[PDB]
Design a protein around this nucleic acid. Structure first.
Lengths: 141, 104
RNA sequence: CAACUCACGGCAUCCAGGAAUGAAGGAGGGUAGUUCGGGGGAGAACGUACUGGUGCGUCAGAGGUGAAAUUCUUAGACCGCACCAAGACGAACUACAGCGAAGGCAUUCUUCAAGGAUACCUUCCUCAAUCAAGAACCAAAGUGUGGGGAUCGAAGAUGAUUAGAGACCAUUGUAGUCCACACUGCAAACGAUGACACCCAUGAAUUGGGGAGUUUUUGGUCGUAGGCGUGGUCGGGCUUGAUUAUUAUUUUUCAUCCCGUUCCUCGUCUCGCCAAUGAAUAUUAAAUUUACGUGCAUAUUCUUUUUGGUCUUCGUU
């Protein structure tokens, strides 16, 4: 069930039983790792890089061939984002809604929503200070 | 002359349909009403007053309308429900009399 | 210091020995379908009707009820037609249908941010469930301030009925009904069924999304036989970058910017010889699934024209 809404989804991805890479690939480790970092320089987040790389190069799960995962790669080269993608996304969303409400003060739905969002921010943040990946001096607004 | 043409239409079940709904989506609907307004503003733009009315009375418009419309979603009827005049040009003697010709 | 088989040595030297279990029928976040809908806010228009007014006609009743009366009229009521004003609302279509956490939400177009489902060999890797305190939201009626005031209408008034009627019924009528900004948190706020997760028999139906699939990897000679694309060499242009130039000491002066084949190196595609997935004489929970057809189908526009050429009307021969 949804975190702070209601709904049951089941839209999902199930990767194959075999964890070995295809026969047909003509890449090797080097080629992959290059293309990862290279596209990262544009300002793509890990998500977007992986999607670009299945649709052009045919590398599905990066982990299978390169022997390690997108975020590890970027950390080792120091291109990993300071505040992690998942929460940064939320923050961006929230700000936009707040802007809207500075002009639209009789809107009700938006404000019900804003609560939910802001709550979620907190919970994520507290698991990025339980798991060290933010300063303990982190704060929202 | 500046006008308003009220319209109306209805969906139509397919001939092999086994479903008791006929209901449309939203995008479907809106297209019709789009592709209605456009045509009734394209034909009547370059057509004058007495030249116009002769279409409506004989139901010439209805032909050209529905036969475009139909593959957007099936229509059972289209009608022109009502027609009305808003803004009129100012009085003239000649443009008037030339539109009646001989007066019995 | 350069040169300099190889070694020692020097170099804020680099990459690889997968260097860190898996990716939950848990949560979160992405990307897309102009996705999906009476979900929410803002703006611009539209529709009849009720009520009032104005103009044009008619002339004596009209309202109302079981029966009446209260009520309005020759200062023309009621009725008919045309038009204007103001406020509220959005019929039928409207459903054992849709959306929202509930309360709730129906004209149209434009616009502003949101949410759910589905699709994925995308990303992250337990971030979750439930819940004293605390916080937000909440039908209608009520309270405050200002605005609006068409309709209906508590309180009140009048007329009836009744033994009585300060009740049901009729004509009226203030608060209220509407809006903006604050207050209140009292519903048969009901499915009288707390939230989250698992197992579980049947036939039709409905709303939203998505899908309907059957010869591959090519290995070895990699074998230039051909083609395609990229970087190099002259050439062409270029005040290209250094730069004579720019005063015509213009004399350049070169690898080069923009173009540039028959040259060398690299990538890829085409072509090729061989090799790779098709041998029944007997069947215990099955080795391979229907169908794949109908009905609809844009000349889809405005032109200003200007040089000829068919015509026409004046002078004059």
């Amino acid at each position: 069930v949804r975190m702070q809404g209601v709904g049951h989804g089941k839209s999902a991805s199930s990767l194959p039983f075999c964890r070995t890479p295809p026969s047909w690939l003509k890449i090797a480790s080097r080629d992959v790792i290059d293309a990862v970092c290279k596209l990262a320089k544009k300002g793509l987040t890990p998500s977007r890089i992986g999607m670009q790389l299945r649709d052009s190069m045919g590398i599905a799960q990066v982990k299978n061939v390169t022997g390690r995962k997108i975020l590890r790669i970027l950390k080792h080269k120091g291109m990993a984002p300071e505040i992690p993608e998942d929460l940064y996304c939320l923050i961006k969303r929230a700000t936009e809604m707040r802007k809207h409400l500075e002009r639209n003060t009789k809107d009700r739905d938006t404000k019900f929503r804003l609560i939910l969002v802001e709550s979620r921010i907190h919970r994520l943040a507290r698991y990025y200070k339980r798991v060290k990946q933010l300063p303990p001096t982190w704060k929202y607004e | 002359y500046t006008l308003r043409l009220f319209v109306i239409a209805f969906t139509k079940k397919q001939s092999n349909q086994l479903s008791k709904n006929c209901y449309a989506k939203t995008r479907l609907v809106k297209w019709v009403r789009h592709r209605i307004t456009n045509l009734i503003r394209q034909r009547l733009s370059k057509v004058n007053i007495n030249e116009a009315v002769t279409l409506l009375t004989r139901n010439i418009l209805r032909d050209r309308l529905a036969k475009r419309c139909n593959p957007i979603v099936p229509l059972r009827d289209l009608r022109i429900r009502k027609v009305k005049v808003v803004r009129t040009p100012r009085f003239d003697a000649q443009a008037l009399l030339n539109a009646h010709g001989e007066i019995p």
